[PDB]
Amino acid sequence: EHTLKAVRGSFIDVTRTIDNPEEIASALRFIEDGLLLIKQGKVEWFGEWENGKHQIPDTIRVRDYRGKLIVPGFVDTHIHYPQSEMVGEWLNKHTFPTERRYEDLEYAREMSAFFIKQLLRNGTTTALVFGTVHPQSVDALFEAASHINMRMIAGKVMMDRNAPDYLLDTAESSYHQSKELIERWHKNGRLLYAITPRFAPTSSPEQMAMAQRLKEEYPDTWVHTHLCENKDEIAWVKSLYPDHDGYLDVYHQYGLTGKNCVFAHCVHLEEKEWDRLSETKSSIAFCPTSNLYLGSGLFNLKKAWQKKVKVGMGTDIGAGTTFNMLQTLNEAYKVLQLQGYRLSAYEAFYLATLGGAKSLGLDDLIGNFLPGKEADFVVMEPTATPLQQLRYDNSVSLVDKLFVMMTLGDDRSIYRTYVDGRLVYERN
Amino acid sequence: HTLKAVRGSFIDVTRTIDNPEEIASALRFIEDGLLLIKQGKVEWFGEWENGKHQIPDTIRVRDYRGKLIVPGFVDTHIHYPQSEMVGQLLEWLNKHTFPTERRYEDLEYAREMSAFFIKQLLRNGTTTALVFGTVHPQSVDALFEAASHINMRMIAGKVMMDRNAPDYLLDTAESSYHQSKELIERWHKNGRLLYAITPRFAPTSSPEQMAMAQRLKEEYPDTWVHTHLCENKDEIAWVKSLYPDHDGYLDVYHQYGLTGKNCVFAHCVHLEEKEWDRLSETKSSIAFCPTSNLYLGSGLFNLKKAWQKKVKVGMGTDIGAGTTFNMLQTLNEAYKVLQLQGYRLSAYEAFYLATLGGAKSLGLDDLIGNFLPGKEADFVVMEPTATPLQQLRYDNSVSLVDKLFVMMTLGDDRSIYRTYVDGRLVYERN
Ligand SMILES: [Zn+2]
Numbered sequence: 001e002h003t004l005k006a007v008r009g010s011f012i013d014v015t016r017t018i019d020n021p022e023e024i025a026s027a028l029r030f031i032e033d034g035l036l037l038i039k040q041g042k043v044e045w046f047g048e049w050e051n052g053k054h055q056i057p058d059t060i061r062v063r064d065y066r067g068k069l070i071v072p073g074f075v076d077t078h079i080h081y082p083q084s085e086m087v088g089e090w091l092n093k094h095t096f097p098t099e100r101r102y103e104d105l106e107y108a109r110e111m112s113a114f115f116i117k118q119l120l121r122n123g124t125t126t127a128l129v130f131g132t133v134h135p136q137s138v139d140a141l142f143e144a145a146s147h148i149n150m151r152m153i154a155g156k157v158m159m160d161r162n163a164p165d166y167l168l169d170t171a172e173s174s175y176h177q178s179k180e181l182i183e184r185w186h187k188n189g190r191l192l193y194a195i196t197p198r199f200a201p202t203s204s205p206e207q208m209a210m211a212q213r214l215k216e217e218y219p220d221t222w223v224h225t226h227l228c229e230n231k232d233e234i235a236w237v238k239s240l241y242p243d244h245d246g247y248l249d250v251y252h253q254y255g256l257t258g259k260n261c262v263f264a265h266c267v268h269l270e271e272k273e274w275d276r277l278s279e280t281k282s283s284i285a286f287c288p289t290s291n292l293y294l295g296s297g298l299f300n301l302k303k304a305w306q307k308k309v310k311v312g313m314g315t316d317i318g319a320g321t322t323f324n325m326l327q328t329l330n331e332a333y334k335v336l337q338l339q340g341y342r343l344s345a346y347e348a349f350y351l352a353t354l355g356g357a358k359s360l361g362l363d364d365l366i367g368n369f370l371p372g373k374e375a376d377f378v379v380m381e382p383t384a385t386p387l388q389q390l391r392y393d394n395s396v397s398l399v400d401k402l403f404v405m406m407t408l409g410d411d412r413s414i415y416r417t418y419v420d421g422r423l424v425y426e427r428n
Numbered sequence: 429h430t431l432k433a434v435r436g437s438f439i440d441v442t443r444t445i446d447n448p449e450e451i452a453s454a455l456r457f458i459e460d461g462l463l464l465i466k467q468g469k470v471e472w473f474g475e476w477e478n479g480k481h482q483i484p485d486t487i488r489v490r491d492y493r494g495k496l497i498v499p500g501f502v503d504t505h506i507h508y509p510q511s512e513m514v515g516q517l518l519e520w521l522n523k524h525t526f527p528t529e530r531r532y533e534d535l536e537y538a539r540e541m542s543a544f545f546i547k548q549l550l551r552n553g554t555t556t557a558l559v560f561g562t563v564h565p566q567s568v569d570a571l572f573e574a575a576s577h578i579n580m581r582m583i584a585g586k587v588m589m590d591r592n593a594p595d596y597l598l599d600t601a602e603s604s605y606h607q608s609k610e611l612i613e614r615w616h617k618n619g620r621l622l623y624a625i626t627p628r629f630a631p632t633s634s635p636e637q638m639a640m641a642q643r644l645k646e647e648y649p650d651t652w653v654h655t656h657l658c659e660n661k662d663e664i665a666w667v668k669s670l671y672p673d674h675d676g677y678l679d680v681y682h683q684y685g686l687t688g689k690n691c692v693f694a695h696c697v698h699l700e701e702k703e704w705d706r707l708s709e710t711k712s713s714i715a716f717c718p719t720s721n722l723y724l725g726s727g728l729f730n731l732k733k734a735w736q737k738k739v740k741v742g743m744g745t746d747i748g749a750g751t752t753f754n755m756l757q758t759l760n761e762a763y764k765v766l767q768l769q770g771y772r773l774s775a776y777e778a779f780y781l782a783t784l785g786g787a788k789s790l791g792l793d794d795l796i797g798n799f800l801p802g803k804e805a806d807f808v809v810m811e812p813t814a815t816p817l818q819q820l821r822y823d824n825s826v827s828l829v830d831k832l833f834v835m836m837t838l839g840d841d842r843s844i845y846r847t848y849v850d851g852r853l854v855y856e857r858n
């Protein structure tokens with residue numbers, strides 16, 4: 001509530017949200033010789049060392065990270081906590097049996113600690129997290145995040161049909177369990193609840209009606225589901241909800257579109273669906289790694305810009321094979337090159353930080369070093385491979401340095417992770 | 429000569445095969461294995477209890493229990509002088525490739541980067557690579573010198589390039605003949621070293637230079653041939669505009685006598701039916717380079733069609749354009765490229781491509797690629813539990829195929845604990 005922390009090094013952030021990718025250059029700030037001052041888990045002051053250093057009393061030691069890159073904490077807008085151990089239709093062989101283990105509270109506790117360590121080790125300070133059907137396991141996840149005062153959005157999976165009996169809830173149990181978790185965890189410190197129907201195929205009309213009820217009763221909770229990942233899933237949803245005008249219309253007619261409504265994947269959207277997401281101000285989680293690993297297809301980021309739809313990056317751990325947001329951006333580059341779309345390092349860095357924060361409606365809280373922002377940040381270095389150090393040494397522009405961090409970065413690039421203005425992870 | 433004795437869990441493929449479904453039958457796992465090495469070759473291989481009596485008391489067993497031991501990985505397309513490269517047209521070549529390669533005109537730079545290049549292969553468990561050198565012959569000597577010091581089986585050559593590129597990087601048809609010949613004489617079958625005649629590709633080689641490449645292959649029948657083929661539609665159109673009297677891109681190389689046994693074509697993303705059949709008939713080899721194919725948006729190599737056409741395929745990192753030396757990450761990208769074609773790459777097929785399959789594509793499968801008696805002792809000690817996420821996923825895998833899938837497609841350089849070349853330890857993880 002009191003003492004100042006002073007962090008010195010080279011900082012990169014985007015200073016405001018934008019509407020066109022061509023505007024990112026104008027919003028990007030690089031301070032090679034920067035100073036970040038932290039008070040009460042927030043940015044007190046940020047800018048040039050020479051402009052700010054006079055504020056540092058002799059009673060305080062400077063944390064010197066000169067030679068490293070310091071960026072805002074990465075934002076993962078779609079990840080499954082109970083799928084860390086998962087290795088490769090898919091649902092019945094892999095997802096469901098893996099998730100089954102998280103009924104054991106002691107397993108859920110151990111894996112909550114492992115899950116949070118994996119995010120911090122990868123520089124992820126905020127995530128929108130799929131829990132389990134089991135509410136004990138969402139408690140374990142929130143308890144782990146709560147210990148370090150992490151800003152995390154999570155929820156109990158709602159799933160009453162078309163899956164194994166060991167993983168089914170009911171419409172009613174899914175209402176009461178979600179409400180009780182909302183009551184314990186929503187706006188509990190920096191924690192936030194998302195109403196999390198797995199997706200249309202595994203939720204009865206009765207359960208969709210409960211999800212709608214929860215959103216009506218708790219207007220400031222998040223909504224988090226899957227949307228149009230694969231053509232079979234879309235066909236299956238149309239066959240189960242034939243009176244609705246396609247997949248998104250199911251969620252829309254049940255009042256689950258709007259501000260802080262996050263749809264994962266959105267690979268195979270109709271024109272009408274793109275416009276609905278735009279009009280509702282609903283959010284997409286672009287999950288390139290799983291989209292390639294399952295051969296789901298190529299997310300049209302160009303169209304999302306055209307349609308002014310909020311996009312954040314998701315790892316979709318489980319189906320995606322990395323926690324790392326730099327590797328996720330690398331896969332985004334690959335997905336986009338196959339569409340002849342050239343993802344700039346500026347745009348990638350935007351999507352990983354303030355862009356994703358905007359997609360979760362948290363851009364007033366995190367995502368750059370503006371005064372008043374929550375002090376979540378990552379000390380990075382290009383030391384992952386000798387090849388990364390070589391390419392970084394041969395880089396002179398900020399775009400080239402960002403590019404080397406994106407294309408050859410992994411967990412070894414993350415030196416330190418700060419959550420709530422406190423050191424919560426060192427590499428070693 | 430004296431014996432070395434290696435103990436731990438081994439996996440290899442014991443014979444080349446015709447279908448991916450046949451690999452399972454050729455796959456050998458020995459949990460408690462012993463490998464005996466004499467004169468850089470496999471003296472004896474099999475169960476610890478069947479072989480340990482042959483271990484004289486004068487030598488210590490190298491005990492790698494808890495690790496997996498595999499044959500050294502084969503990288504069938506990589507550019508030595510492009511490690512430091514950072515970057516809607518093949519003016520990728522003009523902005524990135526050509527300026528980067530220009531630095532390797534300094535012999536002292538080329539020597540420093542030869543040492544770095546070899547270190548990066550060993551650190552990633554690559555023991556054999558088919559390497560694009562420089563246009564400069566003193567820089568190919570640097571590369572061969574470095575490989576020679578540890579008696580590596582490496583295939584490399586001087587790049588031939590007389591046109592359509594910056595002046596600082598052009599040779600001539602004649603200089604390209606004499607330079608290549610001199611390197612062939614110094615290095616081809618010098619220990620385990622092998623020369624490849626390396627015209628960069630059709631666009632950057634005059635008819636006169638293609639005529640020299642043809643001449644060298646005629647004069648040196650047991651050298652390799654190594655070029656690029658049909659990576660992207662612009663490149664193909666450019667080749668058709670420069671060689672309009674030839675029946676497409678591959679016909680250029682074929683009419684100049686550069687197809688056949690030990691002729692390796694990198695990429696082959698955009699092959700016509702006629703081109704697939706020509707490579708098949710000629711017994712020519714493809715280097716599948718998924719990572720660069722994705723980074724440059726070249727497209728998706730049709731591995732299914734290569735199986736249908738009985739065309740040898742090996743994996744290439746295409747460093748430069750690719751971002752990793754690591755064969756496990758390369759196989760990961762291969763899995764992704766193939767899933768977009770609804771082709772499911774099994775662990776068996778990934779493991780096969782990285783080892784005996786790639787060795788077959790380079791014509792080296794009688795020399796390397798498994799632990800059969802008489803094979804060259806190039807192998808990698810792997811810790812597939814090297815990171816906590818890897819330990820978790822491996823522990824949670826029940827079958828050999830699931831473990832091999834985690835080890836072979838979701839590992840990185842941290843998985844490589846020890847690399848052995850010519851039966852000697854040449855790399856330990858720090
Ligand atoms: Zn998901």
Ligand SMILES: [Zn+2]
Binds near residue numbers: 694746
């Ligand atoms: Zn190449």
